[PDB]
């Protein structure tokens, strides 16, 4: 019954609340996407656009929650770029060892940070890992986590090493499948990093709309924004 353009009209305020809260670049992308839905001819076109708003918005609220910079997909560093600029003396060996798996060089996680296209800087990798493991242990939230480790090497107290933190996030119904597939994809490069002597942590997590509002990986305020906007939109596209 309701035309798609009319569906966007009734959700004007929830989506304006959404755009106001997201980071600058994240908000513009979701706004452009919203206008594609409003002008969409086919139901397939509108659905695909809404899917992308769902992911882009969620990642914008993940950045705000963790005080990380939101990075558009286009500006996101690959693994190869991270090794070249953070571990330049090992980039050659990184290339040689990825001869049989060259796709590894192009892996682009949602967040690619290193300890303090550009790799972002974070004050403590282990603090981020702990935060994730705490919420996982406290609210039962599925995560997967892996750390490079050359042979059986001990951590050390007399010298610091550079290290990377690789993070995958997502907003989708199959949370367990998301984190299982992410860690499987990265297990290969973790093993590679071990053999190069490069310290990396990989973390993956996911939320869906059935998650209790106080239990997401994003602030509860942001949960209400997504639920009142993109989530309702999906319900309206299906009925109409």
């Amino acid at each position, epitope marked *: 019954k309701k035309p798609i353009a009319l569906i966007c009209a009734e959700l004007y305020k929830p989506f304006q609340d959404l755009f106001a809260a997201l980071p600058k670049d994240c908000s513009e992308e979701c706004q452009t996407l919203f206008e594609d839905i409003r002008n969409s001819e086919s139901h397939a076109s509108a659905w695909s656009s809404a899917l992308r708003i769902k992911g882009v918005a969620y990642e914008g609220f993940f950045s705000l929650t963790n005080s990380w910079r939101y990075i558009p997909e286009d500006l996101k560093p690959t693994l190869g770029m991270a090794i070249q600029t953070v571990f330049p003396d090992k980039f050659e060996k990184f290339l040689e060892r990825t001869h049989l798996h060259p796709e590894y060089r192009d892996f682009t996680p949602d967040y690619l940070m290193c300890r303090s296209i550009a790799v972002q800087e974070v004050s403590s990798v282990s603090a981020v890992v702990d935060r994730f493991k705490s919420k996982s242990s406290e609210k039962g939230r599925p995560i997967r986590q892996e750390e490079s480790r050359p042979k059986t090497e001990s951590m*050390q*107290e*007399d010298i610091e090493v550079d290290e990377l933190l690789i993070v995958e996030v997502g907003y989708q119904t199959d949370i367990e499948g998301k984190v299982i597939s992410d860690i499987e994809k990265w297990k290969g490069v973790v093993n590679l990093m071990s053999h190069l002597g490069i310290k990396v942590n990989v973390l993956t997590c996911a939320d869906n709309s059935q998650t209790p509002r106080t239990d997401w990986w994003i602030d509860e305020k942001y949960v209400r924004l997504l639920l009142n906007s993109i989530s309702y939109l999906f319900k309206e596209l299906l009925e109409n």
Partner: antibody
Framework: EVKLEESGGGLVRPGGSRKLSCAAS????????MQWVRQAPEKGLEWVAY????????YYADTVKGRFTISRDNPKNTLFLQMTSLRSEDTAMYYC???????????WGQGTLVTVSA | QIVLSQSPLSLPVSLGDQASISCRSS???????????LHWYLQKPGQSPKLLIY???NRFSGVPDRFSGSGSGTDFTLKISRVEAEDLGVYFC?????????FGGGTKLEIKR
């Protein structure tokens, strides 16, 4: 002067439990990893456990895994070893130690004797 | 686990002579951070162990300069340039590159008479 002072040793029945403490002084305890090392009578040294300064990283010898827990209280400058399911093979002098800047054993306590026997 | 093999098991040496103790590692002790965590201890009879040398060749502060260490990879040596009566006891190498940290079996330094 750096000093480590173990306590809590004594006699335990096999299968029993015992908690060791180590009081640290003379340096900023909270900044450094701490370790437990043991020595069975007339035998060599055997490393037991390591705990990082912020307790984030913990390592155990394979013979104590599942039975011993290392922990610390940084405000109280104290290191702990909680021992459970003790066996006669755990009879030993227990030393706490620290590298005061690394994973080597630069400083050692005087040790505390734990005897596991019925 | 890393196995550390000390030789000889016991070392008779006259006062004033040099002593050399060898420590062989079952795998390289070079850490990916560039350091080599092989260390040397002395346990005098009835006392707790004492650090002599850390990371291969660094004499611990206050250790007599007659003690020195050398080596790389899997092959390491502790030298006492001129043995004194106080050096009686058991010398241990140990490594902290890999978990578990492990000790050599000990070399007893015996004073020749």
């Amino acid at each position: 002067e750096v000093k480590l002072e173990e306590s809590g040793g004594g006699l335990v029945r096999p299968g029993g439990s015992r908690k060791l403490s180590c009081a640290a002084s003379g340096f900023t305890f909270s900044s450094y990893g701490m370790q437990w090392v043991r020595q069975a009578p007339e035998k060599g040294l055997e490393w037991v456990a390591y705990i990082s300064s912020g307790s984030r990283t913990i390592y155990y010898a394979d013979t104590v895994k599942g039975r011993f827990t290392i922990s610390r209280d940084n405000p109280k400058n104290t290191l702990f070893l909680q021992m459970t399911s003790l066996r006669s093979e755990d009879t030993a002098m227990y030393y706490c130690a620290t590298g005061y800047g690394g994973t080597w054993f630069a400083y050692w306590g005087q040790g505390t004797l734990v005897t596991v026997s019925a | 686990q890393i196995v550390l093999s000390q030789s000889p098991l016991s070392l008779p040496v006259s006062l004033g002579d040099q002593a050399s103790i060898s420590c062989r590692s079952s795998q390289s002790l070079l850490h990916s951070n560039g350091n080599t965590y092989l260390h040397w201890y002395l346990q005098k009879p009835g006392q707790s162990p004492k650090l002599l040398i850390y990371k291969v060749s660094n004499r611990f502060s206050g250790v007599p300069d007659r003690f020195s260490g050398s080596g790389s990879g899997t092959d390491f040596t502790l030298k006492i340039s001129r043995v004194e009566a106080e050096d009686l006891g058991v010398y241990f190498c140990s490594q902290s590159t890999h978990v578990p940290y492990t000790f050599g079996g000990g070399t007893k330094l015996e004073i020749k008479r």
